[PDB]
Design a protein around this ligand. Structure first.
Ligand code: NAG
Ligand code: NAG
Ligand code: NAG
Ligand code: NAG
Ligand code: NAG
Ligand code: NAG
Ligand code: NAG
Ligand code: NAG
Ligand code: NAG
Ligand code: NAG
Ligand code: NAG
Ligand code: NAG
Ligand code: NAG
Lengths: 50, 420, 88, 49, 198, 49
């Protein structure tokens, strides 16, 4: 699940059988860290038309 | 079953029978009108391909379609801003209600703002706001006029309609008591202003009851604001379908650019890239076309709403079935999320009564025609009343003009005319 | 601001009739050295009609004014040749 | 502004020129731990062949 | 800056034509943008491949241009219907629609020709130099109310007069400008005043 | 009447789904237009004999 964005901690909990999460759209909302088993949230960094 | 077109009424039409009403009731009805949609501006380059220089090169090689889409989105946003500005900002001078509230005897505390609110709105406006309920390149630009500014616009419009009436939109503000304004609005639909000064308490009570019923309907019924909710849902569904279109290969190996670039050789990789790019470009073109059609519809609706405001809030229009079902007396605009709500105050007569009518009467051989009345009779005596309210008056020469003799008119009846 | 932040213009606490719409009520204008200011746009004057149920305002004079407004009716009607446009 | 407008004279108002976007700096490789290690030690460094 | 809408329409049409002629000279994923060099420097298979690619690109561009032209034509037709009904309701007659034939009371309109548009000259009647007076709903002299027929019961402090609703013209309160209906015991705001009998 | 073509079309996204939604919207628009144009009165009247 490649991509780019800001990786920050969140408040949602994942059962110990699931993987990276999604949202109402078809984008990757959150991912499960396969190293420390921590819940991380994916937020794309700020962008906008000048 | 077969649908019914309504009831089955049979009006007992007769050449000497008329029905003049003896009572009336004020019914306040709402009319939802969308003014503007959410301001969206999708980035063509970022939506077609993200984090890829070959995609940008190929896309600038295909032409300037992204520039056309950006120009169309900018034009749509400018059009929405212009519609929002032309609908609400009709007066160039914000008015304020006086501290004392003695508007003839009516209770306007349900639509005027209160200082105990950070948004400076009213109770009905708060109910309307509470009723209606970034990813890969799409953004939601905020509108120019904020909610507080639209609320202040509506407050100034209400103040001008209450204090000045209709002169605030046709020149300077001219203060006038609410009773005189209501009398002059009644004297523009046919009924004489003398019925308002004699039944002001009943009219005020009926107006308060209508306001209470409107508040109860807005608080209970959740499907009242249907047009704005439908527009918001359509915009959300369009955005969701536009976002979900990226999870499609359009006849390729995959849907991720990095996977194709790292798995396939450069020629086949650029072939799949071209396929994905033309697919997403067709998708964005259809989305932009649908958005332009919806924006044209919203602009037409906003022009209609602005005309309705300028013709019913800033004045009185005698157009039948244009501002509420019935004789339009006045209206009050109310703010709404991406919309406007008009409180059309109408005059609906009721409790009619059968009467015997006649075209004219000739006292001494010369026919007498009523100026602005009707020759009704209760069997024994003849009287002249108004056309929208029963008011028996003695048939005098001061309200009936004489022209010719009673030799050609069909329906003449003999009657005496009192001479002052 | 609400749509981001403005870099290159000072934020003043004034309120004038703005000409350049920025967004969410923010408006910029070149006004006094002079520079670009960033103030919340105003909605006009602050007139307050002293309403009372004992007085009326009847005008005594009138000024005839001629207001103009333009309205497009037609465009430039064109017609393309598909066979020659696509293939010359 | 003068470049995107294709004119040396620019009037007042708002004008969009380009799209600002923060670019990444480095990459992060995330993979599970190495637990199911292939017993290559007993193959090459065996006691009997 | 007054002639904005017509100038904006002309500029939009010119920009559409220019971008169409520019898109005709695009690559659309091919090796060039001229058909002669493609048919003369390529084998027939790749030649017809690039030709059909350019054909699809130009067809998509022309379809987008036609859709934009249709949307603009619908908008212009709506604007033309609005201009026609405004012409009919302002020039061919006095309209009572507030804020339709100019801002203020409508008097008359003078149409003017314009390139791809129409310019109006709506004459508006706006009052000015107003002054406040003392008003009342009605008066009663012989124990019976006297509501004004067509006018406003004003008073400069001492004497009461009746004037028009849009122009100050004090006149003597006579029986020809007011009508009697009921007694002056139900209306709120009644004032005592005598009426002059002609 | 083809399954492979159905799969290849579904691989192109949900375009004709939006097309069917637009067609249903057009049908509902025509219905409500006819209703608001003709069905304006809420009580059918009858001409006298
Ligand atoms: C008219 O009807 C209302 C009910 O809506 C009633 O309160 C009122 O007394 C009636 N007026 C007359 C004159 O009967
Ligand atoms: C007006 O209505 C409000 C709420 O609708 C109520 O609290 C108030 O007592 C009413 N009367 C006056 C004179 O405000
Ligand atoms: C008038 O007459 C018709 C038929 O003669 C009758 O149905 C109706 O009840 C009468 N009264 C009114 C108020 O219409
Ligand atoms: C008709 O109205 C007059 C006026 O009040 C009244 O004197 C008369 O008794 C009425 N006749 C009937 C039959 O109601
Ligand atoms: C009304 O029509 C009837 C026919 O039923 C006729 O006898 C009567 O004379 C007519 N009255 C007038 C005033 O025309
Ligand atoms: C009305 O009066 C005239 C003369 O005064 C007479 O010729 C005529 O017959 C009368 N008509 C009726 C219906 O009484
Ligand atoms: C306005 O109406 C109120 C209603 O009670 C009355 O007391 C007052 O005298 C009237 N006039 C003014 C100037 O307030
Ligand atoms: C009305 O104002 C005009 C200026 O526009 C002035 O020339 C004229 O004398 C004024 N009329 C009166 C009666 O004051
Ligand atoms: C991987 O090793 C680290 C280091 O001790 C440990 O903290 C982590 O829990 C391990 N994760 C798994 C999935 O074994
Ligand atoms: C065998 O032992 C040598 C010496 O310690 C070591 O370098 C080598 O990695 C070992 N073989 C394997 C497969 O680990
Ligand atoms: C008009 O308003 C002024 C403002 O205070 C007031 O003094 C005056 O009494 C009002 N009436 C007249 C006739 O001037
Ligand atoms: C008010 O109008 C009367 C009407 O003649 C006039 O005599 C008087 O001078 C005017 N002014 C005052 C202050 O009464
Ligand atoms: C007006 O005249 C009546 C009749 O005598 C009197 O009762 C009243 O006090 C007078 N003044 C008013 C109504 O202000």
């Amino acid at each position: 699940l490649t991509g780019t964005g800001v990786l920050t901690e969140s408040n949602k909990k994942f059962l110990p059988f699931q993987q990276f999460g999604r949202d109402i759209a078809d984008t990757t909302d959150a991912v499960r860290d396969p190293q420390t088993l921590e819940i991380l949230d994916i937020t794309p960094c700020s962008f906008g038309g000048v | 079953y077969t649908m019914s077109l309504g009831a089955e009424n049979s009006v007992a039409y007769s050449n000497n029978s008329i029905a003049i009403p003896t009572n009336f009731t004020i019914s306040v009805t709402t009319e939802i009108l969308p003014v503007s949609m959410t301001k969206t501006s999708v980035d063509c380059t970022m939506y077609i391909c993200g984090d890829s220089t070959e995609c940008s090169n190929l896309l600038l090689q295909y032409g300037s379609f992204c520039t056309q889409l950006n120009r169309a989105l900018t034009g749509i946003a400018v059009e929405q801003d212009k519609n929002t500005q032309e609908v609400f900002a009709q007066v160039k001078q914000i008015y304020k209600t006086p501290p004392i509230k003695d508007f003839g005897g009516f209770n306007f505390s349900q639509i005027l703002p209160d200082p105990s609110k950070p948004s400076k709105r009213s109770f009905i406006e708060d109910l309307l706001f509470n009723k209606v309920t970034k990813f890969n390149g799409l953004t939601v630009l905020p509108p120019l006029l904020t909610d507080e500014m639209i609320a202040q616009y509506t407050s100034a419009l209400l103040a001008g309609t209450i204090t000045s009436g209709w002169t605030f939109g046709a020149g300077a503000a001219l203060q006038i008591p609410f009773a005189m304004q209501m009398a002059y609005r009644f004297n523009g639909i046919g009924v004489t202003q003398n019925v308002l000064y004699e039944n002001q308490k009943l009219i005020a009570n009926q107006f308060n009851s209508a306001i209470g019923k409107i508040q109860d309907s807005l608080s209970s019924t959740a499907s009242a604001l249907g047009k704005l909710q439908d527009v918001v849902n359509q915009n959300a569904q369009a955005l969701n379908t536009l976002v979900k279109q990226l999870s499609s290969n359009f006849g390729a190996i995959s849907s991720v650019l990095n996977d194709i670039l790292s798995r396939l050789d450069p020629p086949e990789a650029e072939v799949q890239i071209d396929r994905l790019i033309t697919g997403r470009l067709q998708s964005l073109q259809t989305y932009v076309t649908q958005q332009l059609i919806r924006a044209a519809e919203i602009r037409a609706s906003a022009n209609l709403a602005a005309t309705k405001m300028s013709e019913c809030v800033l004045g009185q229009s005698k157009r039948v079935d244009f501002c509420g079902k019935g004789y339009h007396l006045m209206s009050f605009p109310q703010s709404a999320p991406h919309g406007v709500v008009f409180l059309h105050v109408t005059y609906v007569p009721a409790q009619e009564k059968n009467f015997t009518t006649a075209p004219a009467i000739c006292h001494d051989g010369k026919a007498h025609f009523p100026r602005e009345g009707v020759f009704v009779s209760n069997g024994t005596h003849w009287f002249v009343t108004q056309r929208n309210f029963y008011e028996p008056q003695i048939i005098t020469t001061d309200n009936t003009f004489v022209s010719g003799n009673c030799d050609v008119v069909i329906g003449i009846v003999n009657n005496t005319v009192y001479d002052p | 601001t609400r749509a981001g932040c403005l870099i290159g213009a000072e934020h003043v606490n004034n309120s004038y009739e703005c000409d350049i719409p920025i967004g969410a009520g923010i408006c910029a204008s070149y006004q006094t050295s002079q520079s670009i200011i960033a103030y919340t746009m105003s909605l006009g004057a602050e007139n307050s009609v002293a309403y009372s149920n004992n007085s009326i305002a009847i005008p005594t004079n009138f000024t005839i004014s001629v207001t103009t407004e333009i309205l497009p009716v037609s465009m430039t009607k064109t017609s393309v040749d598909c066979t020659m446009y696509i293939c010359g | 502004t003068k470049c995107t407008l294709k004119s040396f004279t620019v009037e007042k108002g708002i004008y969009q020129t380009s799209n600002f976007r923060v670019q990444p700096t480095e990459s992060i490789v995330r993979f599970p731990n190495i637990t199911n290690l292939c017993p290559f030690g007993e193959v090459f460094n065996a006691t009997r062949f």
